[PDB]
Amino acid sequence: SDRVRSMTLGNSTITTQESANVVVGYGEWPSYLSDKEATAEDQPTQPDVATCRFYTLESVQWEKSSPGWWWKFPEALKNMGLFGQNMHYHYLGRAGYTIHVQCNASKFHQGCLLVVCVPEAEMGCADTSTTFPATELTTEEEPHVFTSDSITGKKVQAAVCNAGMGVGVGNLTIFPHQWINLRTNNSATIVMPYINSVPMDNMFRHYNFTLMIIPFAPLNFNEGATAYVPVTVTIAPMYAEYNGLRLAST
Amino acid sequence: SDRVRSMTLGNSTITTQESANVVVGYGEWPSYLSDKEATAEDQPTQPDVATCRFYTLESVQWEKSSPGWWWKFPEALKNMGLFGQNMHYHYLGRAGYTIHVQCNASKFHQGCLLVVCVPEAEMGCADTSTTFPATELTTEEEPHVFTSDSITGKKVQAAVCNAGMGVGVGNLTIFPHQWINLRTNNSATIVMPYINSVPMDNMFRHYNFTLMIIPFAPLNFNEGATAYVPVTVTIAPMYAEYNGLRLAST
Amino acid sequence: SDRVRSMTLGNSTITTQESANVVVGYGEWPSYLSDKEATAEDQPTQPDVATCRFYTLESVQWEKSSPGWWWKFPEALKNMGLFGQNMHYHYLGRAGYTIHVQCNASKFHQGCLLVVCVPEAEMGCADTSTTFPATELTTEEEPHVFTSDSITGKKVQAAVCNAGMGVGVGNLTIFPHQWINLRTNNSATIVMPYINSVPMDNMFRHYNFTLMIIPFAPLNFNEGATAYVPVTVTIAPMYAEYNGLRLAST
Amino acid sequence: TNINFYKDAASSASNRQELQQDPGKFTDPVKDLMVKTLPAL
Amino acid sequence: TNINFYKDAASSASNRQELQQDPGKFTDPVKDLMVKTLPAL
Amino acid sequence: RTVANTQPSGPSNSKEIPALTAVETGHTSQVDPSDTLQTRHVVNFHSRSESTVENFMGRAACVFMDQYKLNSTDNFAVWTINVREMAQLRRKCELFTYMRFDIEMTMVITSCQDQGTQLEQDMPVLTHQIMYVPPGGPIPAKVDSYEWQTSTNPSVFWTEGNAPARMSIPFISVGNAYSLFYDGWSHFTQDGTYGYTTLNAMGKLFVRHVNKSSPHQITSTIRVYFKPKHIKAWVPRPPRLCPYINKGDVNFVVTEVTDARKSITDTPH
Amino acid sequence: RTVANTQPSGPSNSKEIPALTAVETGHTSQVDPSDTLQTRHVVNFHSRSESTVENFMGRAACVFMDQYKLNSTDNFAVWTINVREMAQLRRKCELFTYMRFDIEMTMVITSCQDQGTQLEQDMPVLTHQIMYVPPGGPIPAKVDSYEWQTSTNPSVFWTEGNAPARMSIPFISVGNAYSLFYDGWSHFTQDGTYGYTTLNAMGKLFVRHVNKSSPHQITSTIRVYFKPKHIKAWVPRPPRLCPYINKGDVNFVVTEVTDARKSITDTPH
Amino acid sequence: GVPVLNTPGSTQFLTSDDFQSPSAMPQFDETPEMHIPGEVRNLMEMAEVDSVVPVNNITGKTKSMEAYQIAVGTGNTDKTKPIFSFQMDPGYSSVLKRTLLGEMLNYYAHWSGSVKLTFLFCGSAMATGKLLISYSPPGASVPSSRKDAMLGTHIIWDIGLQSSCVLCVPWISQSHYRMVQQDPYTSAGYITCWYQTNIVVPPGAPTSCDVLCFASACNDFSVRLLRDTPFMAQPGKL
Amino acid sequence: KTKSMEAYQIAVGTGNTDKTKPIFSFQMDPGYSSVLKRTLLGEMLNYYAHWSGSVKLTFLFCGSAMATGKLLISYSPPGASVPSSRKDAMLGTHIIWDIGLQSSCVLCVPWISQSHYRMVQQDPYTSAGYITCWYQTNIVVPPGAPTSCDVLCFASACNDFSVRLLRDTPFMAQPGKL
Ligand SMILES: CCCCCCCCCCCCCCCC(=O)O
């Protein structure tokens, strides 16, 4: 059946029993950078399993009032195994991420998550005049929550309706998107390839994409149901190739 | 799977996820009246999609104490689109009705409906001496409810045990019958062809058949479950052919 | 002979003994909308005889002083059988109308009617500044009479010389036209196909054409001749195809 | 000459050299063929 | 017509006559083929 | 491509009666002068050229004249794009109910230099932006509004003193033809806008000066000339005898069928 | 090249359930009207032309409007070359993250002849030098500085009253596409300039009058129109509902998802 | 680049020019063409089709329907007088100027071809009479006697079952193209209808019968020089 | 609700009240309809003046897995009043959505138009139909499941869909220099 899925990228494996078809990012499977499309002359470091494995990020509780969360990849993968180590020790890096968001909910739970990988989701500042610091959008440890309404200050505009990029969140399905509907789905897998203008880019200054998990239907459970419904992102970079060995950047 | 079904008769379409195999009426699929079996020399009016579409009738709440309901077709389809208009504007009409009764209930709902198309279900009067008026059995707007016990007056004998025709209701499965068991089924489709002695009959004086929805197991739901469980009849005449254009009859 | 004619469109038939050749509208016989020229993806409802039959409209007495009459089709066919019913129950409709105007007059009657089907005869308001209501031009029940002279008010300019469209009435023969000259003709048949820019149009908002019966020579009969000379329009839509089943519009 | 210098079909010179004509749509719209050399009836 | 009068490729008319389209990148991005005539699961 | 040649004829006493026809049939007689009378063999080198709808609409005629000024809503000219504004081309287009024509607009713009107390300041060559807003598109409210940014709206950006601007427009009607005559209401309730105004809603044309301002008021007149080409006339109509009164409706004042003559037998000269 | 024709359909009672899909899959249903309902065989001669990104960007739209004067830094107009300055083409370009387009700039320049006490002196035809300084190149500080010597910088040197200047520009981005959206900091420390400002640094455009001076102040408006051609859109994005606030960042004020209607059941007309 | 010398006709907007111009919306998918019946590919087709002419355009009757009605009567009075008379040239003749051929003539400056006037007897079916419909070529006075009309081109209309005789003016001109505008050089002839025999009617039929004249263009008909129509006068902005 | 996330949420409930009332109703034309104007097809429609094709609205039931119900999603072609009864919606084009494992029924509006290209701008001539969702059956839920379930409508373009005449979008309004 299509509901069952098993992804064995690297050492870590993910097995699911209610998971719809995995959304290959824009219909193209990730692969190593070809010689035709390569602009860096350094020898590419290609750990097939050291870095191309499923990294389980911090699980965030999907509350009833939770408007959404976002992870900024690949910067959200800092301090996460040898992928983060290679990020630190390389000037240029390319990876195709097969994000797998796990939301285990019972048959009595009402809710739906748009798990969408937005390539280059330029976030808007809460105050348009200024620019937010890096901490406001970076997702090194915890997902950055979209606010239900407008916020102010030197932060990221977290209005869920505008998805933080001045863009209609309902139209976010234009990007590689999968829906975790607790009626049917408990996990969404998006195999997003390396998406950038330059064939390889630095993994700190530039975030290749943002995984936005937007609860369009808020979690609705009657009393007695599990209140701590976790939204666990398990992202596995695929065909990760790095050029430009350098001093570790911290 | 057999549980999923999709019927696209005419403009309206019906899609179901838990629906058993559709009961073709007596094993013969409806079709237009052949020249061999035709007795009317008028040119048949055959709207392929204007009249041969799914008409959603009034939804009746399946209460715990509800003994049953009946619709008298094709007279129940009066004032229902161009099928009713062609009924009014034609002396003779033939149609094969693929009735689709929708009873959406949760997994915690106990009940079972015998949705049976009884051809020529001659109804008995509550008082045997007299004859009930047309309003008592006709189903133009609302289903006529079978009573749990015997009733009296110039009405239709609505005793559910006798099915209103002096016939054992448990034996009603002799006619094209489908069971909506909320354990398994939430919708029953019976593709009943045109069933009458004469190849074409008037659609007002004669009711080609009666759709009797008899809850054999009454709806049983614990507190907290949806109490308004609707029994929605969506009947689509198929291969509807009319002869004898005349003044509209009202 | 060419004078005798017989048209058996649908259930109703028209037989005439003094009727000139039927004016096929612009030389093209009506037909169902081809797949090449179709823009609506709905399944077309095509009643071959239910709607494609001769509908006899209200007969209007051709008085000596009568300047003319007009019928606005297909809106003049409202409340006229299943053609009107399909008009009400469909968003888009196409039909080729073989109008047959019957003017039975003796051999001692002097008169001549330009029975002309003007496609899209946009009528001018009596007062140019304002726009007339729908009742002024619509021909649901009775023909709207052209006035011999100019009229004023929120009505249709009914000046017969200008044909109500600012156009020379003598030049109205540019449209599919047939003459009922009581010297020779007593009935005119114009088989006008569906004439519109869009392959199918709504039959209420837009009137596909207007049948203008303009007595160029007023009825002249000596005393003792039948004074009630009726002008009876019997219009039969042909190859009537409707898309967009919807709620009845009234 | 007749060379079209613009890709779009509408962005071309008017077809002033086309003299196709079918008056029978208006002058002879009757279903039954009418010959001038016979009575019209 | 389609003749390019400038040597540089960018110095040419827009390719407005190219109507290539692959909606499957966005409408059908799933790894396993999904046919409309079967349950999606 | 020439018209039919007059075939030679002679004396005839037969039952053919070519002259004797019946207008009751609705068929215009196909008779020739050789039929009714006796004619010589005349080879008609005359051709029905320039009488073609393609050639007849080939003559470009004005459809929109407006005055928009330099240095409110008077600084740019708004045109609900319809052929009916000018009677000269309107009656040509109203000869046919449906015309599927690729319309070739040729804007002719002439600055006026409005007579004022001071007119001693010479403004450089005035550029003119003729923007086309499709129906339902963003309609500018000022001469410097964001709508004038032609991200998608076509615009010639014509400069004065050059060849008159000309941008051929394809067939943009939602239907398969331009309904010059449309006896139909906008709404299905048969209430609303009656006439060609309903179907012939082809957007708007906003004409402005690309120059921000001038020392003295300059009111350039935009004279839009519409040349239909690739025309497909489909339902012929007579010319409107009555003068045009409204540009959004066929509403008319009654007019005589023809110029009245003293008598039915009055033949001048 | 036309769109797929609507295949003929009929009544169906099967297990195919074409209408029943799953948005949980993330795959938009490929269903047709023939699948859900019963449709006639309609040959769709409609084509997805003018909807192509090549055709959609074909419409040239303004990206830079500035006023530079004749007779300091106000005598020439400086443009940090970005599509984001004007919202009309910016939202078009922001429909896609990466667009590899050869950009066709068509400068439209109109002199204004600023209203002053004396404007009785007529200046000859004003020539305009639109110089392009590549990123990191010498940026002029005066209208007569050495940078205006175009040894390597391209320049149209357009003269007023002629056809609008147009110099097609190739794909000059250092990367393989123009990142209209770039959620990345300028520096690897993740501190600096966030947004498209980092990667979309394509130099500057300095517009000046080639004429040395004029007797009276003339402030010509440079209206740069960018026509993308040979576009390669690579990652589609939704249009930005919120109005654009900053031309160097995506920063926005919150805006409603759509125009609010009175009720979920509120259907006008 | 290529050396190009501008002709003295450069930078002009000639109205009748076959010059290609850039498309407003390039690669615009025009709505697919459908076979709408009656495709007019020439307006001489609408000239060829019959059109009731206002023969009786006497003052006041143009407003009413009697303009087209050609009055005939079963009376000995004025039998030696024309039923009607008017000028043949559809361009400027009051009768023929606003008809289909005339309206498609005043949109032009030159016209050539055989006008054919179909005359429909709109009277009693038993009303039988003989008329003499005569086109007299120009160069002589308007026919004042039936013999004078007979001396020119003429057809005897025996009113009967057909009830429509077509008087086809056989293009008797000294030039290949007559001028639509009123000029004596290309002045056309005179079309006059007389009584060859009275309109005999039975006692139960009206004497004052009516005739309709349908001026139509033959296959010979053509127009050569386009011009703005004098009929359509626009006093001001609509 | 446009500010919050409930704009997309189509509320459904296991209550007998207002069961004879539409779950929702709006205009089919993506050009000017409030619901469909800012969506992907609508946003790529207001950049144009003419639009043709079959809009397909995929409806996702974002409720309890055991919440089963039958809806009647109906496109009614124009020319008649907006459906005020479920029978009126049934008389037009409609699909019965039996909510189940698939949980997404696609209501494909079968381009019921009188012209080859409807106009994006609001005009009664090319005015589209009305898309209304009703209850064919109640949303039956177990006692442990929420009654107030949510539905998401995904308006998408079919292969037929095309736009013909480009125009500047009315949504993107620039008050001044950025
Ligand atoms: C400046 C470039 C774009 C030009 C666009 C202006 C012309 C718009 C299209 C006009 C269509 C034909 C006229 C209206 C319809 C009619 O009544 O025939």
Ligand SMILES: CCCCCCCCCCCCCCCC(=O)O
């Ligand atoms: C005057 C001749 C030279 C013209 C050079 C001006 C245009 C420079 C290149 C522009 C690149 C595209 C716009 C910026 C990048 C983007 O945001 O897409």
